[PDB]
Amino acid sequence: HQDPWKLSADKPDSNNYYGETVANGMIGIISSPEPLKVKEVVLAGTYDIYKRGRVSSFIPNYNLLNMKLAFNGESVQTYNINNYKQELDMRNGAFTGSFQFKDLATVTYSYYALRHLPHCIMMVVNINTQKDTEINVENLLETPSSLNNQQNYFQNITNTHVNIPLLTSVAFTPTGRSKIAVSNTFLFDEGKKLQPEILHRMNDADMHAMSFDKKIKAGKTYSFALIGSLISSDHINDPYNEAERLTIYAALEGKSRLLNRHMQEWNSLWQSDIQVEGDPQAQQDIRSMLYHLYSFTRKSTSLSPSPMGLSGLGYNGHVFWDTEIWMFPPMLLLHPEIAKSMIEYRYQRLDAARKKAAIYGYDGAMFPWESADSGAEETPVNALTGAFEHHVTGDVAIAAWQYYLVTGDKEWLKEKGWPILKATAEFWASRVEKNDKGEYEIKNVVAADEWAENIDNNAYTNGTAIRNLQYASKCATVLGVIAPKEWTLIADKILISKMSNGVTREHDSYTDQNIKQADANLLAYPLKLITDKEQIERDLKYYQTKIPQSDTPAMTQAIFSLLYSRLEDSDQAYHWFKDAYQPNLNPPFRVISECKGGTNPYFSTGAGGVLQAVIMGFGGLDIDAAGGIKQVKSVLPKNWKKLTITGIGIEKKTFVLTH
Amino acid sequence: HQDPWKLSADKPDSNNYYGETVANGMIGIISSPEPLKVKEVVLAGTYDIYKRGRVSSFIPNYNLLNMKLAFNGESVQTYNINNYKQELDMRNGAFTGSFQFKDLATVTYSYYALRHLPHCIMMVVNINTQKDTEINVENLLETPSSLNNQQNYFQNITNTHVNIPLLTSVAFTPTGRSKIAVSNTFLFDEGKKLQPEILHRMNDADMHAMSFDKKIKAGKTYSFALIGSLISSDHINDPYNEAERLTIYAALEGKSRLLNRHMQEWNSLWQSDIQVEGDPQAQQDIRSMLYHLYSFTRKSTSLSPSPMGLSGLGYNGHVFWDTEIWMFPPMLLLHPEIAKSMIEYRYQRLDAARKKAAIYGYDGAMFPWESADSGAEETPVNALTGAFEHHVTGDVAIAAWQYYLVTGDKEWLKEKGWPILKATAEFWASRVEKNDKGEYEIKNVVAADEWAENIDNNAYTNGTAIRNLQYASKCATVLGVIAPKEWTLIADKILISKMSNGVTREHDSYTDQNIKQADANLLAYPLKLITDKEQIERDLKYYQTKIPQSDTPAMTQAIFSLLYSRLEDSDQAYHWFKDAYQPNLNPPFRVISECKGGTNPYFSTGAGGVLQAVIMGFGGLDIDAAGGIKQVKSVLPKNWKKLTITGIGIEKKTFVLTH
DSSP state of B316: G
Q: ∠ at Cα B509 (B504, B511), nearest 5°?
A: 55
- Residue type present at position A176: G
DSSP letter for each residue of B111-164: EEE-SS-TTEEEEEEEEEESS-EEEEEEEEEEPPTT-EEEEEEEEEEE-SS-EE
Tell me which of B20, B244, B324, B594 is the catalytic residue.
B594
- Residue type present at position B108: T
Q: Which residues pair with A601 in a beta bridge?
A: none
CA distance A42 to A50: 14
- Residue type present at position A295: S
**CB–CB of B49 and A205 under 8 A?**
yes
CB A471 within 8 A of CB A397: yes
Task: Return all residues near A493 (Cβ < 8 A) that are at least 6 apart.
Answer: A434, A438, A439, A440
Rg (CA), chain A: 26
CA dihedral B45, B49, B55, B60 (to 10 degrees): -60
DSSP letter for each residue of A92-110: TTEEEEEEEETTTEEEEEE
Residues of A in contact with B207 (CB under 8 A): 51
Q: How would you classify the pairing of strands A94-101 and A133-142?
A: unpaired
Q: Residue B9 belongs to what H/E stretch?
A: strand B6-10
Q: How would you classify the pairing of strands B274-277 and B433-434?
A: unpaired
Give the closest residue to B368 by CA, choosing from B355, B380, B386.
Answer: B386
Q: Which residues pair with A653 in a beta bridge?
A: A648
CA distance B275 to B657: 10
* CB contact B387 to A (< 8 Å): no
Q: Residue A657 belongs to what H/E stretch?
A: strand A653-657
Stated in angstroms to one decimal place, the resolution of this structure is 1.5
Q: ∠ at Cα B522 (B521, B525), nearest 5°?
A: 105
**CB–CB of A204 and B145 under 8 A?**
no
Cα–Cα distance list, B378 to B29, B326, B349, B373 (Å): 25, 20, 13, 9
Give the closest residue to B302 by CA, choosing from B288, B323, B326.
Answer: B323
CB B351 within 8 A of CB B359: no
Annotated binding-site residue numbers of B for beta-D-glucose: 52, 321-322, 369-370, 385, 450-451, 516-517, 551
Give the closest residue to B304 by CA, choosing from B621, B605, B606.
Answer: B605
Strand positions, DSSP E, B401-502: 433-434, 440-441
DSSP letter for each residue of B13-59: -GGG----EEE-SSEEEEE-SSTT-EEEEEETT--EE-SGGGSEE--
The gap from C-alpha B187 to its chain's centroid, in whole angstroms, comes to 31
| Cβ count near A280 (within 10 Å) | 12
Residues of B in contact with A550 (CB under 8 A): none
- Residue type present at position B347: Y
CA distance A493 to B469: 102
Straight-line distance from the first to the last Cα atom of chain B, in angstroms, rounded to the nearest whole number:
28
CB B619 within 8 A of CB B631: yes
By C-alpha distance, the chain A residue nearest B147 is A145
Give me the half-sphere count of Cα atoms (radius 13 Å) on the Cβ side of residue B419. 15
CB A295 within 8 A of CB A616: no
* CB contact A145 to B (< 8 Å): yes
| Cβ count near B485 (within 10 Å) | 9
Q: Which residues pair with B277 in a beta bridge?
A: B642
CB B26 within 8 A of CB B234: no
DSSP letter for each residue of A315-367: GGG-B-HIIIIIIHHHHHHH-HHHHHHHHHHHHTTHHHHHHHHHHTT-SS---
CA distance A215 to A192: 17
CA distance A515 to A493: 26
Q: CA quadruple A203, A208, A209, A210: dihedral positive or negative?
A: positive
* CB contact B550 to A (< 8 Å): no
CA distance A572 to A536: 14
* Residue A492 annotated in ligand binding: no
CA distance A58 to B560: 56
Q: ∠ at Cα A338 (A332, A340), nearest 5°?
A: 80
CB B204 within 8 A of CB A56: no
CA distance A427 to A77: 59
The gap from C-alpha A373 to its chain's centroid, in whole angstroms, comes to 16
* CB contact A148 to B (< 8 Å): yes
CB A311 within 8 A of CB A604: yes
| Cβ count near A313 (within 10 Å) | 19
CA distance A508 to B475: 93
DSSP state of A143: P
Q: Which residues of A does the annotation mark as catalytic? A: 450, 594
The number of residues making up chain A comes to 659
- Residue type present at position A396: V
CB A43 within 8 A of CB A180: yes
Give the closest residue to A27 by CA, choosing from A320, A334, A298, A348.
Answer: A298
Residues of A in contact with B174 (CB under 8 A): 148, 205
- Residue type present at position A249: Y
CB B468 within 8 A of CB B497: no
Reduced DSSP (H G I as helix, E B as strand, rest coil) percent helix, strand, coil of chain A, to 5: 35, 25, 40
- Residue type present at position B604: S
DSSP state of B416: I
Question: Nearest by CB to B51, which of A50, A53, A206?
Answer: A206
Q: Residue B227 belongs to what H/E stretch?
A: strand B221-232
Residues of B in contact with A201 (CB under 8 A): 382
Q: Residue B255 belongs to what H/E stretch?
A: helix B239-269
CA distance B387 to chain A (A): 16
CA distance A444 to A455: 5
CA distance B603 to A497: 72
Give the closest residue to A373 by CA, choosing from A45, A130, A114.
Answer: A45
| Cβ count near B45 (within 10 Å) | 17
**CB–CB of B204 and A15 under 8 A?**
no
Q: Residue B285 belongs to what H/E stretch?
A: helix B280-295
| Cβ count near B579 (within 10 Å) | 19
Q: Is A315 left (phi over 0), alpha (psi -120 to 50) or beta?
A: left
| Cβ count near A452 (within 10 Å) | 19
Q: CA quadruple B580, B582, B588, B594: dihedral positive or negative?
A: negative
Strand positions, DSSP E, A205-329: 207-216, 221-232, 274-277
Give the closest residue to B21 by CA, choosing from B75, B58, B68.
Answer: B58
* CB contact B500 to A (< 8 Å): no
CB A263 within 8 A of CB A195: no
DSSP letter for each residue of A618-639: IT-EEE-TTSSEEE------TT
Q: Is A222 left (phi over 0), alpha (psi -120 to 50) or beta?
A: beta
CA dihedral A469, A475, A478, A483 (to 10 degrees): -60
CB B311 within 8 A of CB B602: yes
Task: Return all residues near A260 (Cβ < 8 A) that are at least 6 apart.
Answer: none
CB A509 within 8 A of CB A452: yes
Task: Return all residues near B582 (Cβ < 8 A) that are at least 6 apart.
Answer: none
Straight-line distance from the first to the last Cα atom of chain A, in angstroms, rounded to the nearest whole number:
28
Go through A549-559 and write b for each residue having 16 or more CB atoms within 10 A of its CB, e for each that does not: eeebbbbbbbb
Give the closest residue to A445 by CA, choosing from A453, A433, A437.
Answer: A453
**CB–CB of A148 and B206 under 8 A?**
no
Mutate to test the interface with B, among A15, A150, A204 (most CBs of B within 10 A): A204
Strand positions, DSSP E, B534-584: none
